[PDB]
Write a protein that binds this ligand. Sequence first.
Ligand SMILES: O[C@@H]1[C@@H](O)[C@H](O)OC[C@H]1O
Ligand SMILES: O[C@@H]1[C@@H](O)[C@H](O)OC[C@H]1O
Ligand SMILES: [Ca+2]
Ligand SMILES: [Ca+2]
Ligand SMILES: [Ca+2]
Ligand SMILES: [Ca+2]
Ligand SMILES: [Zn+2]
Length: 316
Amino acid sequence: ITGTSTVGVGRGVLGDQKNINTTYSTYYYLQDNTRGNGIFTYDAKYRTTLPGSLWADADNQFFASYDAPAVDAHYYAGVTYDYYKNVHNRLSYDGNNAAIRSSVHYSQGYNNAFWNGSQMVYGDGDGQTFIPLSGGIDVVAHELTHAVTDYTAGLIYQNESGAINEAISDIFGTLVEFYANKNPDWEIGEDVYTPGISGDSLRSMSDPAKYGDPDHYSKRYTGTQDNGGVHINSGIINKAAYLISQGGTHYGVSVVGIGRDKLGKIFYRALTQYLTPTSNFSQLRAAAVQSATDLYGSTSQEVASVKQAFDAVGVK
Ligand SMILES: O[C@@H]1[C@@H](O)[C@H](O)OC[C@H]1O
Ligand SMILES: O[C@@H]1[C@@H](O)[C@H](O)OC[C@H]1O
Ligand SMILES: [Ca+2]
Ligand SMILES: [Ca+2]
Ligand SMILES: [Ca+2]
Ligand SMILES: [Ca+2]
Ligand SMILES: [Zn+2]
């Protein structure tokens, strides 16, 4: 909508207070004009028709319980936009400042979030398995990164290319969590997952096997569930990414860590320059080695650590 840009205040899913960019035109709308062609947050009103209604508020204060998922969806979309612009010089998910749209209050008791090809969608959770999923910055950045992938490598969402697709979203979801310095870790979804159980998460990049996901190519899932295990076999790539950044010894192979920033540069270059819709794990290794070579040289420690990490998880 057309109107005057301003700043509102509210509280997010976890009770933290934050400022949010809004637009004033009779109502205050969750429309952020400061980032590209805009960030728009919609109310799905417990239905499944999308996008719903552009979020309208009478007084520019968002402290109601019903407001919390919208505040966080809106705010964390902005942080993720900032990450890609400031760190990778990318303007929104299409590289041309496409508008970012999110809908919250999707369905009833819906324990998931997703990119549907055009926008982000967030359930409120059932209060037991999940609380509203926009409360996790790594979740929001995970979903928005699916849009980046769709507009770049276009990895098909099945089998090995789909597991790469999932891992990319976990990797950059985590790097955004570190970028915002919001209690960062190498776990996925810990802030919104099982509010009754402390210390757990949906997936672990540092130790995928903690939750039964494979940490080595020999342990990959080969069945048909989960589109061929796109959320399961991502653990193999997640572990490799963790080893590249932090280092360690895994199945007897030692990796020297090179840090989060170089991990991000290497995988972003592989995603945007070398990966294709049908890339498999072996081709991801080649893309990451080539990207490390482009950036740091064929004889660099960086190239060495990429090779070691994929050796450690058994990807040749
Ligand atoms: O309080 C909530 C209200 O803000 C929303 O608009 O509709 C559902 C209610 O529970
Ligand atoms: O009002 C929402 C409620 O419907 C849901 O159950 O928990 C999250 C709240 O935002
Ligand atoms: Ca209000
Ligand atoms: Ca965290
Ligand atoms: Ca996390
Ligand atoms: Ca928990
Ligand atoms: Zn995903």
